[PDB]
Amino acid sequence: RPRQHLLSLTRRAQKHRLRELKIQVKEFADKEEGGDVKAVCLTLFLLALRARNEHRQADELEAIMQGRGSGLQPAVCLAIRVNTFLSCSQ
Amino acid sequence: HINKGGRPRQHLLSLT
DNA sequence: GGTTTTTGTCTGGCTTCACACTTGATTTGCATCACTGTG
DNA sequence: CACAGTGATACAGCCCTTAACAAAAACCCG
DNA sequence: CACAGTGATGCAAATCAAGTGTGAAGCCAGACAAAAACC
DNA sequence: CGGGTTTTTGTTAAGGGCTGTATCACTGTG
């Protein structure tokens, strides 16, 4: 049977395509980086993203991994609402 | 074996 | 029928999130109020 | 020399690919 | 029976902070085992 | 004390693509 799209696969039915490769992922990380896998995959995915010119999603991933930037200060919210000539209902 | 020195291997998240 | 893909399971053991109660203590939501403005 | 808009357009700037080379910082040991 | 604002006020409702011991879920191991779409 | 080794960081140029900013004749309270 012909293959399907990688993203449409379930959480379990997509291991037979990464089984051959994640083993060299760990051995490379062990012999060069020290043993970290999440970090060495994160840097690889950042490489792919910024090569693909998707810096917006790259920065979003960086924010998710680091401290979340969600939430504005009340002072800056008021500054926006006032200096953009906005009304309370809008 | 003899140690040849070199720059220490910093954590991969702390490089450029 | 072959071939490849797609899901299913196995038990011991690990982490990770939700909850069981209760009493306040906030924080968010939405309706009220008499009015404008284009005629 | 009023000063903050008003929106469309065009140009500059910055960041990825190839691959080999070059300036520079951190230990090791004679 | 025009309809979208206009902002302050006030009360109903949602979320939570405190305490620890649970349940419930996701996943790791490597391996064995059934459905299903093209020849 | 300084080569030697390992690693970091930048550089060279032809292209592609996203983002940022200057420029144009005008407004409006008078």
> What distance in Å separates the CA atoms of residue A8 and residue A80, rounded to the nearest whole number?
41
Probe site for chain A from B9, B11, B13 (most A CB atoms < 10 A):
B13
Q: How far is the CA of A77 from the C1' of C22 (A)?
A: 37
Q: Does A80 touch chain B (CB under 8 A)?
A: no
| Upper half-sphere CA count for residue A30 (Cβ side, 13 Å) | 6
Cα A12 to Cα A53: distance, rounded to the nearest angstrom: 30
User: How far is it, in rounded angstroms, from Cα A46 to Cα A4?
Assistant: 25
Q: Give which of A41, A47, A46 is closest to A62, Cα–Cα.
A: A46
CA dihedral A62, A64, A66, A67 (to 10 degrees): 140
Residue among A43, A5, A44, A53 nearest B14 (CA): A43
Rounded Cα gap, residues A28 and A3, in angstroms: 29
d(CA A55, CA A47): 10
Check residue A87 and give left, alpha or beta (phi > 0: left; psi -120 to 50: alpha): beta
